């Protein structure tokens, strides 16, 4: 029973002690909702902690870290207890054990601890987990081990507020540059998702990704055979193009747009939404980058999703037509109109997402403000396609930001 296990774990006889921690591990690895609460209150934690120090007994160290790993895999209150029992420095000491079964289970325990919070992340980092962890990446390492290493490397990147230190980011990227060429499916997915979080932190870390030189190996993953790899890559590269125009160009300089005809027509709508969301930020840059969306024959595919796509895809598509409207030249907006952008763009005012309504009308505002002579020409298109009637009825007080816009547009051109 429980009380006997917590007692037999203190024996001086290794035989009874080991066979007692083996029982403490199974009770934590016998289902998916283990009795972890009753295990913490059972006082087993300090005995499991001290077992980590028995360099003379490796099999005791393995079973001890396994038990502590699964307790850390629970809630934050469950994970705090493992770190509150002074087990983190002993795990780090085990990273250099001459028994690979002990090195691996110590890595596994640290990842769950790192994943709980940025405080617990910076704690294990300050002690120096990155340098020995990345020392495991080698030819002779098994694949099941490397998968655990890459996953801890994800949590080392996972949180952005506060973001991980630069010293650690500068140490991880030269390993991602090595792990991005792996053949295993799960390793590559984790190697790209870590890039997604590093590109999600901020522009200061996006340049670290750029300066590392890994983007030329990240863009071709937009056409990888596995959808799991593109989804992370589409998110990873999708964040890079959210900073400065000089950083977005590095993405386009890797022929990023030549991978999107297979994404704008993908059957999965999540990819479609994630694809147009990328092109939206591209339409926010300078005119040369806006022209790159035009020189790739992507605008008709954006408009098609703007017409027949889903709500989440149309929201990012209306954004894509908007950022281009207030940034590009007159012929680029004129190119939009001759591509029959007028009918579907106005058919999104009836949505209850005020953000989209503001987006289209502002884009509807900047269109009419750019074609100075073709005001009557374009106005007939909006009136014939049924937009003006929807423009007229948008003068309601349920949002002054919309009311003010839908009136000035009418007062100047209608």
């Amino acid at each position: 029973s429980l009380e006997a296990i917590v007692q037999n774990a203190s024996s001086d006889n290794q035989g009874i002690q080991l066979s007692a921690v083996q029982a403490a591990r199974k009770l934590l690895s016998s289902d998916r909702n283990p009795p972890i609460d009753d295990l913490i209150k059972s006082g087993i934690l300090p005995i499991l902690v001290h077992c980590l120090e028995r360099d003379d007994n490796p099999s005791l160290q393995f079973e001890a870290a396994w038990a502590l790993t699964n307790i850390a895999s629970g809630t934050s209150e469950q994970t705090q207890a493992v770190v509150q029992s002074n087990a983190v420095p002993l795990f780090l000491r085990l990273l250099h054990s001459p028994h690979q079964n002990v090195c691996e289970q110590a890595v596994w325990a640290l990842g769950n601890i790192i994943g709980d919070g940025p405080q617990c992340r910076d704690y294990v980092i300050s002690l120096g987990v990155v340098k020995p962890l990345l020392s495991f990446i080698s030819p002779s390492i098994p694949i099941t081990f490397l998968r655990n290493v890459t996953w801890v490397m994800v949590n080392l990147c996972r949180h952005k507020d506060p973001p991980p230190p630069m010293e650690t980011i500068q140490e991880i990227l030269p390993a991602l540059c090595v792990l991005i060429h792996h053949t295993d499916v799960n390793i590559l997915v984790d190697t790209v998702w870590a890039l997604s979080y590093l590109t999600d932190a901020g522009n200061e870390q996006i340049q670290m990704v750029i300066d590392s030189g890994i983007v030329p190996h990240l863009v071709p993953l937009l056409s990888h055979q596995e959808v799991k790899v593109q989804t992370a890559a589409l998110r990873a590269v999708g964040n890079i193009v959210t900073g400065t125009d000089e950083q977005t160009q590095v993405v386009l300089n890797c022929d990023a747009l030549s991978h999107f005809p297979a994404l704008l027509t993908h059957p999965k709508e999540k990819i479609n939404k994630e694809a147009v969301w990328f092109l939206s930020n591209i339409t926010a840059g300078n005119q040369q980058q806006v022209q790159a969306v035009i020189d790739a024959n992507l605008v008709p595919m954006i408009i098609h999703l703007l017409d027949k796509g889903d709500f989440g895809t149309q929201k990012e598509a209306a954004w894509a037509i908007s950022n281009l409207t207030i940034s590009g030249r007159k012929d680029q907006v004129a190119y939009l109109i001759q591509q029959n952008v007028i009918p579907p763009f106005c058919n999104l005012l009836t949505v209850k997402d005020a953000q989209v309504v503001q987006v289209v009308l502002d884009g509807l505002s900047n269109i009419l403000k750019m074609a100075e002579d073709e005001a009557e020409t374009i106005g007939n298109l909006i009136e014939e396609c049924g937009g003006l009637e929807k423009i007229e009825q948008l003068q309601n007080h349920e949002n002054e930001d919309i009311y003010k816009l839908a009136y000035e547009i009418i007062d100047q051109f209608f």
């Binding site: 199974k26 994970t79 596994w108 996953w151």
Partner: peptide, 14 residues
């Protein structure tokens, strides 16, 4: 949709 997990258990068989 397959975001990598935050925490992980190691299941036994045995």
């Amino acid at each position: 949709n397959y975001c990598p997990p935050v925490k992980r258990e190691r299941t036994s068989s045995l």
